[PDB]
């Protein structure tokens, strides 16, 4: 089903958490 | 529901901006 | 709608290419 | 359909899998 999508899009707002935070760590290695 | 779906789909379409942006943040400090 | 959702999904999978190629790019910069 | 967007979901869900391993790849080349 339609809550079982929206509560896969509600892991991918995790990894694009997870996406940003894991950039920051590697811009904060480099500046 | 569906139009709350797309407008979950339209967060991911400013994730994989800040995504690109935020990748191209580090290759202007890297080249 | 749902096709006008499948068709976000496949911008998706065009963003997780230009994700992994443009990871690549910076790679590619570093070994 | 709604089974072939969450089996896209689950593509995403090897993408976001690819994403962390490859920023992983580069923050193990900088530290």
Known sequence: ???XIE???EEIXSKXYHXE???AR???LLX
Do not use: S
């Open 1 to 3: 089903r339609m809550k």
């Open 7 to 9: 509560d896969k899009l």
């Open 21 to 23: 935070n894991e950039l």
């Open 26 to 28: 590697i811009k904060k």
